[PDB]
Amino acid sequence: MASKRALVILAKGAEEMETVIPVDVVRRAGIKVTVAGLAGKDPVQCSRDVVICPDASLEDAKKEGPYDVVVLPGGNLGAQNLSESAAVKEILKEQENRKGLIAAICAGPTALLAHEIGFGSKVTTHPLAKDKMMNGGHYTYSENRVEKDGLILTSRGPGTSFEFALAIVEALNGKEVAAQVKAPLVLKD
Amino acid sequence: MASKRALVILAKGAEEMETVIPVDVVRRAGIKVTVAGLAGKDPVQCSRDVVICPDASLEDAKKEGPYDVVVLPGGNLGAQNLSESAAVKEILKEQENRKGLIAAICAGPTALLAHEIGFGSKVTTHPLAKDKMMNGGHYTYSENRVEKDGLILTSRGPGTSFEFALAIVEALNGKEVAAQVKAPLVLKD
């Protein structure tokens, strides 16, 4: 059938590596990615001052769902902005309700906590975000570089972003497509 | 003294992972990075359609040199644009003449060939860019993930971008700073 679709939610203070790596690798898989700006259509200042122009506002992108995966980058301030957003809450609850994949990296998974998403799952985060994520004991913590418990797919940091992205590709399109996308990247794996 | 400075030259068709990873990691080292747009000040459409807004035009950024490192991302079309640019030629020749570091990744090193930079050095590239780089036998080819022969620092692909970036940090600011920057990244190394 038609190609699958990914929504990447881009907020001020996002970790730009954790944004670009998944966008790029998921597009290499032939999956249609929408980089959606939380605040609107305007360019977004990431944590290390890379400025990325989103494909659409979140307001507009939401209308074009549903998506096969919703992706939440990290960066402490980006994740905080995701956590505070009513629009993000709605999107994640819809995705959960419809049994769609949700993928979050670094501080990103803390937005799952904020929005009460995926309780009872095994999750990982950046080491520095563990205490925030674990407040209340609603998840079981993992130190795996990528963790996947059903439809909740989490990962740890900039340096796990390729593994994270490839896990999203594998979850959507299978092992063989992921292996094919992986090879030209020159990963040490 | 004052902090060191890096120039990252951003052309249409650049590999956005190979652009953002070095920018971010070098900024984590406290080094001042200028993302300079080859074509001007306008946003740049990268190879996988991430759009990045440069900090300055190359025309303007050149004026603010010299730089402790000049960084050339890859992406086949980005590298081709770098290779065709008289402005890039001038910058690289100046940097070479002044015994400053030049760092290039993936297809990026092929711009060194185009501009006659660093002949007689050991270099690596993306596997698919080897034949282009080696036309004429002006360099000695390496399969190391990062290669450094004096002031010519090369690397292979998206999946070597962290190693590449950290090697730039080490070359400028030393092993200890590089190790400090590395740890929070959650690299498998």
Q: How many CB atoms lie within 10 A of CB A71?
A: 28
Nearest CA to A169 out of A68, A74, A97, A88 is that of A68
d(CA B137, CA B131): 10
Task: Please list the residues that pair with B69 across neighbouring strands.
Answer: B6, B101
Q: Determine whether B143 is exposed, middle or buried from the number of CB atoms within 10 Å of its CB (0-12, 13-18, 19+).
A: exposed
Question: Residue B28 is which amino acid?
Answer: R
CB A73 within 8 A of CB A46: no
Whether A127 has its CB under 8 Å from any CB of chain B: the answer is yes
d(CA A42, CA B105): 30
Identify whether B66 is preceded by a cis peptide bond (ω within 30 of 0). Answer: yes
Based on its alpha-carbon atoms, the radius of gyration of chain A, rounded to whole angstroms, reads 15
Question: Residue B60 is which amino acid?
Answer: D
CATH at A115:
3.40.50.880
CB A22 within 8 A of CB A15: no
Active-site pick, A46, A53, A106, A138: A106
Whether A159 has its CB under 8 Å from any CB of chain B: the answer is yes
Active-site pick, A53, A115, A126, A138: A126
Whether A28 has its CB under 8 Å from any CB of chain B: the answer is yes
Angle at B161 between CA B156 and CA B165, to 5 degrees: 115
Residues of A in contact with B18 (CB under 8 A): none
Indicate if A115 belongs to the active site: no
The crossing angle, in degrees rounded to 10, of helices B175-182 and B161-173 is 140
d(CA A5, CA A10): 16
d(CA B154, CA A49): 25
The crossing angle, in degrees rounded to 10, of helices B16-28 and A16-28 is 160
CB B79 within 8 A of CB B49: no
Technique used: X-ray
* CB-based contacts of A76, cutoff 8 Å, min separation 6: A13, A47, A107, A129
d(CA B84, CA B81): 5
Residues of A in contact with B159 (CB under 8 A): 162, 185-188
* CB-based contacts of B55, cutoff 8 Å, min separation 6: B33, B34, B35, B36, B61
**A residues 31-50 closer than 8 Å to B (CB):** 35, 43, 47-50
* CB-based contacts of B59, cutoff 8 Å, min separation 6: B40, B87
Q: B159 and A21: CB-CB below 8 Å?
A: no
How many structural domains are present in chain B?
1
Residue B101 lies in domain:
1-189
CB B38 within 8 A of CB B101: no
Cα distances from A107 to residues A120, A131, B44, in angstroms, run 18, 11, 28
Residues of B in contact with A126 (CB under 8 A): 184, 186
Cα distances from B104 to residues A135, A188, B111, in angstroms, run 44, 19, 9
Whether A16 has its CB under 8 Å from any CB of chain B: the answer is yes
d(CA A48, CA B138): 37
Residues of A in contact with B52 (CB under 8 A): 50-53
CB B107 within 8 A of CB B74: yes
Instruction: Outline where DSSP puts E strands in B11-165.
Output: 32-37, 44-45, 51-53, 56-57, 69-72, 101-105, 122-123, 140-141, 146-149, 152-155
Token digits for B103? Answer: 């760092």
Identify whether B43 is preceded by a cis peptide bond (ω within 30 of 0). Answer: no
Place of tokens 């959960």: A96
